[PDB]
Amino acid sequence: ELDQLRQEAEQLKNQIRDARKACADATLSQITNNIDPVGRIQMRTRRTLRGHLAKIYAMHWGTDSRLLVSASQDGKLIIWDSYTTNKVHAIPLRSSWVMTCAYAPSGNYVACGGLDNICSIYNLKTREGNVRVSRELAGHTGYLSCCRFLDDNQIVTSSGDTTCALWDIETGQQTTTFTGHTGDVMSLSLAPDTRLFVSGACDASAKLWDVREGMCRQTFTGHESDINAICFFPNGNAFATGSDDATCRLFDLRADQELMTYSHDNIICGITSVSFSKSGRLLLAGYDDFNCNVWDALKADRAGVLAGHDNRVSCLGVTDDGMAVATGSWDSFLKIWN
Amino acid sequence: SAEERAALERSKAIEKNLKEDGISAAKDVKLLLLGADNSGKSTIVKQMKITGIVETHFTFKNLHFRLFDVGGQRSERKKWIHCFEDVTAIIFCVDLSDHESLMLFDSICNNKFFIDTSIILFLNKKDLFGEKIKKSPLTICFPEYTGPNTYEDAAAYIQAQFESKNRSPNKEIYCHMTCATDTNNAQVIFDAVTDIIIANNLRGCGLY
């Protein structure tokens, strides 16, 4: 019965590819050729969150676009004030190994987890005055690569054991499970409406999931290497996946296929983090080549280089108000560009 | 600065705390521990030392060793091996009572992030390897081996085979042999760490 199932799967893949290619009436390039280019975008280092003594792995902006949380392997997750350079909090992490850090939209909660297979929850507004551990979310058999807060109660965590999970911080038990990936799920990004999310795994596939009943809606392929970054478009109708092959593409949910690719001859280092702008025109994609380019998400061309780091960047987040972008590289210096 | 003065004061106090913690965390020595599954990883320093990563620490002759027994991570090596770029020395353990360990050593000794990091090697299970050689020839594990089947020469050939997989002369493999019961492992780790510490100190001062 294996042969029949394999033939059915091959026919289904062929018909899916035919349907996807049948809707590509016009490419995005000949549509974006009508806009004048945005021109060179120059951003100066307005601030620098000095105070870290290890490699930076996360920089998540608050909903007020003033508080940024940075996580490092020194064992501390310092919460910064982006206007006055001040450090609001310094959470002592249980384990130095951290590759993701989440900031709740309401600002009360901070999530952080790494190689421990545990996504710990930190309560910023504790009555005792000190930040403490709220809920330790255990249950994964692989490293937690990305965790994002849907709301104050539910957090969607991406693990390295091919299992994107939806949690319940109140009870600490996985309410719903997402499965279907073969490689490590290295990235995750919730939609603006917090009803669905994408995930870019190590097997060069970005599958969008459904938060409610936990079933994959669409699957996207085209990357020849692992996906290190993923993030939704500002409109929620598209997303961009950062691959380790020095290329990032802009998939669309309505078109069910990639629209444009962001590649150049002179770039070979692997992308580490990607993010959009408030209007969605600028795509600040980090790189392992010590810089952090900005991509015109319509014209699909370079518009500037935020080369101000002495090592590879691991996170690049844009404020909720579009005011600034925080690039936290491995050299411990998180710079708040603008 | 109406009440932001106290905000700056808190920032300075916790920055001082961060600096103190950072300079107190540089005392410890990081030792990534690798090897095959059940390859004697947790039977080397049992005279000392206490699901994902497993961290173990012990003190030996005024040194705190951070021994990250990462052997419990059943995932891709590539996606989380850059977190150990700043490791002092990789401790590689190989069981001699059993090609997979050789492949792992080849992949890890020539890794992009481990160009200048010495990779110690612990050829373990001396007695078991000796009995296996006395009962079975090394052709089973090493078909290309061409020599008498005894303990010393076969062990030397295996050690040379592991060492020859190095391709960068900027690193040296501190090969060693243990009988799964000797306590000399701590001394070997200590002297290797002393050597690499001296090398790093000379590198920092513009001397190595």
């Epitope: 001040n86 909090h89 600002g107 005792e128 005055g129 000190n130 | 109406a2 009440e3 905000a7 106090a13």
Partner: single-chain antibody, 231 residues
């Protein structure tokens, strides 16, 4: 949970000495800059001193400087020396933290009674008694000598409610934000120079004495004190 108990009262002869100790238990004491606020038996509250986290800086009032010593085992100390005839009051130990979005003067100590035998910003509450019935809408207006809205946009007009026989509790801080554990019935207002603490659907637990507070700069001068009498 959070408690700031204290002791060290009793009759003190004029010109004598006494020790006031604030025993803060149940929270991270070392991260809070404890204040000290007193209140005459028939007058409004008045600031006394201030010690930061780790004793980095210690401030004092105009009539407090020199003869009072504030020091910090999870205990805050105040040293009473050369007690005049105006030192009689009830002394309140008040914790406070200052970061982005913080809630200064969140918890006030129970207080102990002590008895004896002009360049600052003054707080003026011209109204002294607003008689209202339960379920009605009331407003308590407090005025300022100089504008409190700083350059960053934050105005320092803290609102405190003191029920009869109870320690004061923060209700509205920064004239717009609302403190934790406070029902949405109380709502801050005001802009620039004049401030009001609007009350919506006033209940039987909202009756007491209000004390508008400024925090633009030291000393911390309280308002005159408005008593929201029932009916």
């Amino acid at each position: 949970d959070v408690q700031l108990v204290e002791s060290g009262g009793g009759l003190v002869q004029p010109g004598g000495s006494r020790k006031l100790s604030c025993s803060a238990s149940g929270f991270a004491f070392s991260s809070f800059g404890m204040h000290w606020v007193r209140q005459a038996p028939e007058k409004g509250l008045e600031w006394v001193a201030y010690i930061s986290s780790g004793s980095g800086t210690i401030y004092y009032a105009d009539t407090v400087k020199g003869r009072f010593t504030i020091s910090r085992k999870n205990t805050l100390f105040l040293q009473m020396t050369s007690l005049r005839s105006e030192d009689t009051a009830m002394y309140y130990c008040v914790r406070s933290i200052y970061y982005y979005g913080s809630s200064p003067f969140d918890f006030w100590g129970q207080g102990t009674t002590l008895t004896v035998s002009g360049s600052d910003i003054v707080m003026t509450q011209a109204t002294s008694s607003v008689p209202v019935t339960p379920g009605e809408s009331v407003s308590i207006s407090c005025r300022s000598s100089k504008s409190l809205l700083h350059s960053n946009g934050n105005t320092y007009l803290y609102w405190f409610l003191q029920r009869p026989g109870q320690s004061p509790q923060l209700l509205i801080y920064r004239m717009s934000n609302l403190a934790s554990g406070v029902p949405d019935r109380f709502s801050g207002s005001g802009s620039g120079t004049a401030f009001t603490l609007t009350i919506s659907r006033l209940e039987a637990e909202d009756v007491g004495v209000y004390y508008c507070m400024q925090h633009l700069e030291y000393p911390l001068t309280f308002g005159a004190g408005t008593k929201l009498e029932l009916k």
